Structure formats: structure tokens, C-alpha cells
Amino acid sequence: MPTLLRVYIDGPHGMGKTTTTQLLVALGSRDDIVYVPEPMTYWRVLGASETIANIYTTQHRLDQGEISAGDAAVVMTSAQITMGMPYAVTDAVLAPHIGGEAGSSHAPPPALTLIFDRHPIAALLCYPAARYLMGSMTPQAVLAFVALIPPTLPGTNIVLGALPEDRHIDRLAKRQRPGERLDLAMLAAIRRVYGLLANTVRYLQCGGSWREDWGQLSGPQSNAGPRPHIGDTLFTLFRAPELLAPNGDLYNVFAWALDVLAKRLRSMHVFILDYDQSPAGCRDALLQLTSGMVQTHVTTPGSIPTICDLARTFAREMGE
Amino acid sequence: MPTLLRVYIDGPHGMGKTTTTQLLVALGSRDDIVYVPEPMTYWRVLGASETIANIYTTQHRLDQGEISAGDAAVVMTSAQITMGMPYAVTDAVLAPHIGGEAGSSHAPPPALTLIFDRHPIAALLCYPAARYLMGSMTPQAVLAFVALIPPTLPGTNIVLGALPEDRHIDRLAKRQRPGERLDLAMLAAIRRVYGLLANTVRYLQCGGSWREDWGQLSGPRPHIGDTLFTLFRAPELLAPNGDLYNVFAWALDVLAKRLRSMHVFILDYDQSPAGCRDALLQLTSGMVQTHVTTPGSIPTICDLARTFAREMGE
Numbered sequence: 182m183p184t185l186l187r188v189y190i191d192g193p194h195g196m197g198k199t200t201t202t203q204l205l206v207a208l209g210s211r212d213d214i215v216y217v218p219e220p221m222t223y224w225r226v227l228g229a230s231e232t233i234a235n236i237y238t239t240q241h242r243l244d245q246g247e248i249s250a251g252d253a254a255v256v257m258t259s260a261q262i263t264m265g266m267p268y269a270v271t272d273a274v275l276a277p278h279i280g281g282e283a284g285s286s287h288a289p290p291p292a293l294t295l296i297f298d299r300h301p302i303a304a305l306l307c308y309p310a311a312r313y314l315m316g317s318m319t320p321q322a323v324l325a326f327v328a329l330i331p332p333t334l335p336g337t338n339i340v341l342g343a344l345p346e347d348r349h350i351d352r353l354a355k356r357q358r359p360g361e362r363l364d365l366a367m368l369a370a371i372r373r374v375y376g377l378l379a380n381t382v383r384y385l386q387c388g389g390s391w392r393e394d395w396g397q398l399s400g401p402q403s404n405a406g407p408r409p410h411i412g413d414t415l416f417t418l419f420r421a422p423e424l425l426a427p428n429g430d431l432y433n434v435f436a437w438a439l440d441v442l443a444k445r446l447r448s449m450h451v452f453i454l455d456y457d458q459s460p461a462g463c464r465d466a467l468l469q470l471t472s473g474m475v476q477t478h479v480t481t482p483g484s485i486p487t488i489c490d491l492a493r494t495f496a497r498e499m500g501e
Numbered sequence: 502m503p504t505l506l507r508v509y510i511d512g513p514h515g516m517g518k519t520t521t522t523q524l525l526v527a528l529g530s531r532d533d534i535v536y537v538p539e540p541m542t543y544w545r546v547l548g549a550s551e552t553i554a555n556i557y558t559t560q561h562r563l564d565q566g567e568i569s570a571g572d573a574a575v576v577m578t579s580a581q582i583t584m585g586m587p588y589a590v591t592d593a594v595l596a597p598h599i600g601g602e603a604g605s606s607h608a609p610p611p612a613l614t615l616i617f618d619r620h621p622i623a624a625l626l627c628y629p630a631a632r633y634l635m636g637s638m639t640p641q642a643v644l645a646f647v648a649l650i651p652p653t654l655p656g657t658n659i660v661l662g663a664l665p666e667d668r669h670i671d672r673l674a675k676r677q678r679p680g681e682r683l684d685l686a687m688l689a690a691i692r693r694v695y696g697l698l699a700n701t702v703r704y705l706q707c708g709g710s711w712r713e714d715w716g717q718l719s720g721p722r723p724h725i726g727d728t729l730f731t732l733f734r735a736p737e738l739l740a741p742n743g744d745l746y747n748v749f750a751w752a753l754d755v756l757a758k759r760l761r762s763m764h765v766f767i768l769d770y771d772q773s774p775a776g777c778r779d780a781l782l783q784l785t786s787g788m789v790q791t792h793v794t795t796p797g798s799i800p801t802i803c804d805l806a807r808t809f810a811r812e813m814g815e
């Protein structure tokens with residue numbers, strides 16, 4: 182069975198994620214690598230009307246006190262369902278085609294390389310959590326999303342981004358999505374979330390156990406480094422009043438959500454790309470990065486062409 | 502490895518009695534059976550404040566014309582998340598323990614029997630689909646939920662209820678839930694959804710292919726018009742040329758994959774509580790059992806179930 186390399190390019194928007202990807206795809210042959218692009222069209226029309234505009238407009242009004250927290254929460258939750266839709270369904274139809282791991286460290290080239298614009302967890306965790314830090318969503322809702330995160334397939338290579346705050350602020354200020362607004366508070370939140378995420382993965386892969394270190398709560402990089410403090414991982418966010426019982430402990434329903442969160446991340450292959458350079462540099466940087474990325478076997482000989490058709494149909498329809 | 506039997510008591514709400522339910526609480530009394538009840542406490546306090554009320558009030562306000570279909574959709578979509586949270590979490594933590602089939606039936610009794618009050622497709626598929634037929638949810642949000650439906654593990658036995666509409670109206674009016682309003686339209690919609698649902702599983706199990714039979718919605722197994730697929734011949738999901746968008750067509754593929762491997766059993770609710778308990782006990786001799794993955798799986802499950810019942814149960 183021919184091998185396959187799936188690479189999800191995630192992280193906070195506005196760092197040059199797309200450009201880095203497009204350039205990388207432009208290097209390979211026409212049909213030895215395929216890009217599953219950002220589904221702007223689904224966010225803008227197919228799924229709903231201008232979802233990005235709706236999201237930022239809501240956060241704005243909430244900040245001005247024109248609407249309540251409850252009002253902003255119901256809108257955000259719904260919008261994040263629409264945002265994650267293309268991500269979630271692509272995975273669902275992709276799963277059966279994914280087999281066991283093959284490996285990168287000394288292993289032949291993949292018959293096909295799949296490059297994704299973001300991973301499901303982006304719309305089901307990272308951004309939902311960032312909105313919680315903005316009082317625009319509830320911890321209960323976010324955890325509800327976490328429990329919906331699909332099982333992590335073998336060889337799930339996720340690439341996050343690194344970029345100085347100022348460089349990121351300037352870069353973001355220039356290029357923004359249709360319907361977006363310039364929110365620095367949101368940028369901080371989303372940046373902090375992806376920082377935690379990275380730590381949470383390393384923490385988990387170092388034998389970390391949130392249940393064992395939970396008491397250490399009261400008052401970044403993956404693939405490398407020592408075991409992080411739990412207060413520096415995603416777990417630290419859910420030390421909220423709404424989730425705590427009289428005895429100060431988490432309700433078991435939310436504790437099980439954290440068990441799912443850990444189960445999902447502990448088997449991912451997270452990498453970090455330094456977006457503080459020229460587009461050409463980034464392309465090459467990501468290129469070296471992909472060398473040591475876990476590949477997997479497919480389940481059928483006719484899986485490869487199927488996935489190519491899948492990726493291209495996706496691009497043709499939901500692509501900008 | 503020890504065997505397990507999972508039974509999801511589903512179907513439209515309001516068909517049974519409280520006595521019919523307490524018998525099921527008396528079933529879990531023994532340690533070879535556990536009864537995961539409805540997470541009412543999570544719906545009223547934990548997840549949010551009086552969720553069911555917010556659902557029925559929103560619909561009511563939509564009908565009177567105080568809010569827009571867009572305003573309602575947002576809330577209904579949010580409310581359904583809260584509703585299915587306990588179901589999703591339980592599945593996610595339970596899944597890893599579930600092994601493969603164990604020559605179900607014609608084989609030794611289970612080491613444990615797990616009875617749930619509803620399956621995750623109740624809050625993800627059925628009720629969202631009904632609210633769509635109520636004009637309170639968009640067909641995009643529904644298929645969005647469908648995409649998030651957990652993979653159907655082996656031994657997924659689901660019991661749906663049978664009951665004349667007039668009889669259902671009686672029992673429903675006497676056992677109303679906190680914040681609920683008696684809506685006959687919603688009763689018709691939810692009944693239709695579960696009707697189609699049963700037709701869908703048979704359709705798929707008899708070799709039905711929605712992409713193949715899709716043309717009939719515009720021009721031995723049920724007709725595609727009698728299955729859940731018929732609802733999604735909706736204008737919001739179609740391109741200018743009437744073609745179903747691929748992203749939605751993929752969501753239907755997922756639906757077809759989820760529903761096919763399930764095992765459906767119908768419980769005649771038109772009788773006494775004792776009669777219902779017996780019938781349910783009868784159906785178990787045809788339900789699919791499975792093995793568990795670890796030795797300590799059994800106690801972990803039992804522990805899980807009773808922690809649920811004690812925390813979110815009434």
C-alpha cells in the first residue's frame with residue numbers, strides 16, 4: 182500500500198500561513214501533492230451569510246455593551262459550528278482511507294502529500310476558547326465542542342506558527358479577511374491559546390496527567406523541551422466557577438471533557454514554524470520541517486485518486 | 502474478555518410513563534445492569550440555565566413573530582449543543598472500551614448490560630432535524646451536526662417507540678418537562694423524523710444508495726422519499742442549477758455510514774408500564790453484544806454510569 186503524508190497548517194491567522202502553503206505546493210508536481218484550501222466560500226455563502234463579519238460585529242457590539250453576554254454567546258457558538266463544518270466533514274470522509282503509520286525518519290517518499298488549511302480543532306477548540314477569554318462564549322460550550330472533536334487519526338501532523346507580537350500585529354493590520362475587524366485583544370487571546378495548545382501537547386507527551394496535577398492550579402514549543410507546568414497548558418483555562426461544584430472540584434461531566442481533550446492531543450505530531458522571515462524562507466523552512474513528519478499507509482489501492490478528487494472538489498467549490 | 506450489551510432507549514419523548522421509567526431504575530438496582538438516566542440537572546443548571554425552556558420559548562416567540570427565523574436558528578443551534586453535551590462526552594470516554602462483536606445472541610449472557618436514556622443522534626440529528634421542520638433551524642446547521650456524529654461502534658442497539666398519535670398526546674400532556682410547552686406541530690415533526698429514521702436504516706441495510714436514488718425526489722426497500730434524505734432536498738443546500746453542493750453531499754455520505762451499522766428495535770408503548778418493561782426485556786435477546794478491550798473495562802463503565810446518574814440524573 183502506497184504511503185501518505187497529511188500536513189495541517191494551523192496557528193493564529195495573519196502570520197503568512199496561506200502564502201507559505203501556496204508556495205510549497207507550487208514546488209511539487211501537479212499531482213504528487215494537493216492543497217485543501219481555506220473554505221472562505223462556505224463561511225461567506227454556502228454555510229451562511231458573511232460569517233466572519235457576523236463574528237467580529239458581535240464581539241464589537243458586546244464590547245460596546247449594545248448586547249449582553251448571553252446574546253453574544255449564542256451567536257458565537259453557532260458561528261463556530263459553521264466555521265468548523267468544512268473541516269469536520271472532510272475528516273469524516275477521509276478517516277476510512279487512513280491506515281497505520283509508516284514513518285518519516287528514513288522512509289521512502291509518499292505517493293501523495295495532503296496539505297490542509299487548518300485542522301478541525303481550530304474551530305472546535307482554539308478559537309472557541311479564545312472567545313471564552315473574551316467573555317463572548319462559555320466554558321461549558323467550549324468543552325461541549327471539545328467532546329465533539331473527532332478521533333485523532335494516525336500521522337496527524339499539525340504545524341503551528343511562531344511570530345513576534347509586533348511583527349504579527351503589523352502583518353495582520355495589512356491583510357484581513359472580508360468582514361474582519363482590528364481587535365488586538367482578540368489577537369492576544371488567540372495567540373495565548375495556541376501557545377497553551379503547543380505546551381499541552383508536549384505536557385501530554387511527557388507523561389503529564391491533568392488529574393494528577395490539577396491541584397497545582399489555584400493562583401513555548403513541542404517535540405522539544407522539558408515537561409511544562411499545567412498552569413501553562415490548555416487545562417489552566419477551565420479553572421472557572423461555572424464548572425466547579427460546591428466542594429471546589431470540577432463536575433465529572435467537565436472532567437471527562439478534559440479526558441477527551443487529552444486523548445485527542447496526546448497522539449498528534451505538533452511542529453512550530455518561524456514565520457519571522459521572507460515568504461521564500463518560510464516555504465523552505467516548512468519544507469525541511471516536512472522531512473521528519475509521520476506518514477501513514479492508505480487502506481485501499483484506489484484511496485489515493487479518491488483523496489485527490491476529494492481535495493480538488495473541495496478546492497473548486499469552497500475555495501476563494 | 503467479558504461481554505457487554507449497550508441499549509439506547511430513544512425515540513420521541515413523551516411516549517412512556519414515569520412508572521415505565523422507574524422500573525428501569527429498578528432494573529439498574531442489580532449490578533449486572535446499569536441505567537444511565539437523562540441529564541436534566543445539566544440542562545437546567547450545569548450546562549446552562551433552563552435550556553428546555555429557552556428552546557420552547559424561542560419557538561413560541563418565532564411563531565408569534567417576535568423574532569426572526571435567523572434569531573431562532575442561532576438559539577436553537579446553541580441550545581442543541583448543551584442538550585447533547587452529556588451524550589457526546591459519555592460516548593467519547595466510553596468508546597475506547599468497546600471492543601468488537603462477540604457472537605451476539607445464541608451465546609452466553611453479558612457480563613454487564615448498559616442502558617442509556619437516549620443516543621447521541623437524538624440531540625445531534627433527530628431534534629435538530631425537527632426544529633428545521635419547525636423553521637427554527639437551518640439545514641446547514643443540521644448537516645453540520647451530522648458531520649460530528651461519532652463513528653458507529655459495534656453493538657449499537659437502539660430502541661424506538663411505537664404509539665398512536667392520540668395516545669402520545671395524552672401521556673405527553675401529563676408528563677410535561679420544566680419549561681416545556683405543549684406543541685402539536687413539534688409533536689408531529691419529531692414523530693415524522695423518527696419515522697423516517699427507522700425507514701432510513703432499513704433503506705441503507707437493504708442496499709439503498711442515496712446518490713443513486715436521489716433523482717426520484719424530483720421526478721425491496723423504502724422509497725427515498727420516505728427516508729431522512731428527503732428533508733435535505735432543501736433550497737439552501739442547492740446550487741443555482743439545482744445541484745446539491747458537494748460539502749452537503751459528503752455530509753449525507755456520513756449520515757448513511759452512521760445509520761447503516763446501527764441496530765434498530767421498536768418498542769410498542771401502547772400498554773402498561775409493566776408491559777413496556779417486559780417487552781424491552783424481550784427485545785434484548787436479539788440485540789448485539791460486544792467484547793470489551795480491557796479487564797478493568799467493566800468496573801470503569803459501571804463507575805462511569807453511576808457517576809453520571811448521581812451527578813446529572815434527577
Ligand SMILES: Cc1c(C[C@H](CO)CF)n(C)c(=O)[nH]c1=O
Nearest residue numbers: 194219236261264303304308358
Ligand atoms: C477558524 C476561525 C478563524 C480563522 C479563519 C482563518 O482562515 C478565518 F479568519 N476565525 C478568525 C474565527 O473567528 N473563528 C474561526 O473558527
Ligand SMILES: Cc1c(C[C@H](CO)CF)n(C)c(=O)[nH]c1=O
Nearest residue numbers: 514539556581584623624628678
Ligand atoms: C433530546 C432532546 C429533547 C428530548 C429530551 C427527552 O429526554 C428532553 F426533553 N428535547 C425535548 C429537545 O428539545 N431537544 C433535545 O435534544
